[PDB]
Symmetry: C4
Subunit: 191 residues, 4 copies
């Protein structure tokens, strides 16, 4: 077990974390975090039998609401929390049958970091697209990414493009036709 | 055990190392090491039951005295040593009940490096904020940080901001109100 | 076992992956991937008893054909596949007696990544020359290389020059005279 | 065992590798490799009871002779070889009582890389000062250093300054007075 298994094997759960209004202008690559969030949302719709979409909101009333730029799937499980780690009672039971987790959002050193560490304690295989991850400061971000990259072999940091291709082992995959449509989309900020 | 536990669990000891006058102008990010030193000092005051503040002075009389820019807590244990590693008889017994250590200061390749290696031999969980760490030369510093980043799983290098948030798992924490005051402070050199 | 053994010990198989026309202008260091491909091709000819040369073609008819800039050996095993990972039934049986693999080509995050992960599952010792590896985007590439560099001790990422020297432990090697001819060649893009 | 022990414990052997005339103008940081070579040479003289100095010459007659800029100690063991790895019968028996090795020279991806890998097979603790290491190309060098940095816990890459301070745990060391003289010297190329 070194890469994401084919989408048919086990269950994967996507996790859009704290992509809220208050952070939109305070992060540089926020737009690329929104792009990846949509990329995974459309992917989720293509294979909804094996995938789940979870959206987290941190202290909503006080400077926080999921950015309208992201069109969430109709089967999206949106919860609201005050704990920095996105592991709350509500999502804990939602991952009782899920073997994999795609955590993407903000902040790399804060919410993301404590979420993935908790997910690693639950024996879950976490896969993080650097593509859709950010922070307000570069030093705070860098130090967090270098750390999670040493949490192998159950934690891996790649890109949104690679992740999609990992789940579809073959190009003659029945769903590839629909998946390849997503890879052609151009992210706001060049990669 | 992959991140700092909540401040209520066990004992943590902050370690301000060799932030003296002789180094003030010889280091580029010395001011940011002073900022973090103050950040951890105020944090220590907020939860003094589970935290300890230790300040080290290396060969004081000969070019050395803790910089007046840092306002030390009243419960600070300041000791003076000649050994590069900040593990001397005086601090060895002071860590008989402490499970965690936040080492921050100067120099990354010298005093810091030999301190954390000794702390790892004592089974202690060391957490280092790159935020408040420096060196006179970049190459000396870089080579030291890449090394300590391979001393997992008991050694972790993040930032001052992340570290504070690790100790406070929830934003509805009784102390968060007082802790969040520190995160709003702006470091002299942009991160 | 920490580096490539002398070419006489065991069997090594070179793997030129998906270096096709459609990618020629979409990658920056494509020319250096072609250079290394030729470097390994001539090397293969010098010691053909212990080495094998394998070329992969991904969906040929639809934008794909091995670039004419690469002169393949006469003993080259060229196969065509639709699976992103270059592990297909045809090459699986071709590696029944091979202990080492030199994987070089494109893309670092896509085909390469899933190929080396599968090769690691087969207990094979993979050695990757960063020299002859690329991607359309830097972020996609970087994130892939940082990952495979944590797949030790059976996966190693060096350069084409180092790899050749690893196989020839001594400069008084009977074949060194012919091998040293290859190292003198200048890659299109400076290293 | 995470850092260099005090010079009194066990035996350490310095290794100046292939710092010859033919490479002087083909490497950028060759002068800094010469500086470190002299730094370790003077250090060797200060504690000659526990240290050994070994100089390697690769194919001398044909473009090779130790650079006159380096003043070798009178107790230096200079040998000549044709094997890229600096492990030849002559030095193999010279390390029968030595527990540590400081390998510094050129090339990072070639001679150095194969030397340290062989030294790791001999159970020796290798410590490499990035300070005194180089290559003709940056990509060849970088890929080699990232690799050896994953060969822990018996291989460590720091700087010449840190290494000297590791061996002298205390500043009140009987020899510190003589050692501190070396740290004050300015390397040709700024670090």
């Amino acid at each position: 077990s070194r890469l994401m298994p084919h989408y048919s094997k086990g269950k994967t759960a996507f996790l859009c974390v704290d992509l809220q209004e208050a952070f939109s202008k305070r992060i540089e690559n926020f737009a690329n975090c929104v792009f990846v969030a949509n990329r995974l949302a459309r992917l989720h719709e293509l294979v909804p039998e094996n995938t789940k979409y979870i959206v987290t909101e941190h202290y909503p009333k006080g400077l926080g609401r999921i950015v309208p730029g992201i069109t969430l799937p109709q089967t999206a499980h949106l919860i609201e929390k005050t704990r920095f780690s996105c592991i709350v009672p509500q999502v804990e039971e939602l991952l009782e049958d899920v073997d994999n987790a795609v955590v993407f959002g903000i902040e790399g050193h804060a919410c993301i970091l404590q979420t993935v560490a908790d997910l690693l304690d639950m024996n879950k295989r976490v896969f993080l697209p650097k593509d859709g991850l950010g922070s307000q400061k570069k030093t705070d971000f860098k130090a967090a990414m270098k750390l999670m990259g040493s949490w192998s072999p159950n934690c891996e940091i790649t890109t949104s493009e690679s992740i999609l291709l990992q789940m579809t082992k073959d190009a003659m995959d029945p769903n590839f036709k629909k998946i390849s449509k997503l890879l052609k989309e151009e992210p706001p900020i060049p990669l």
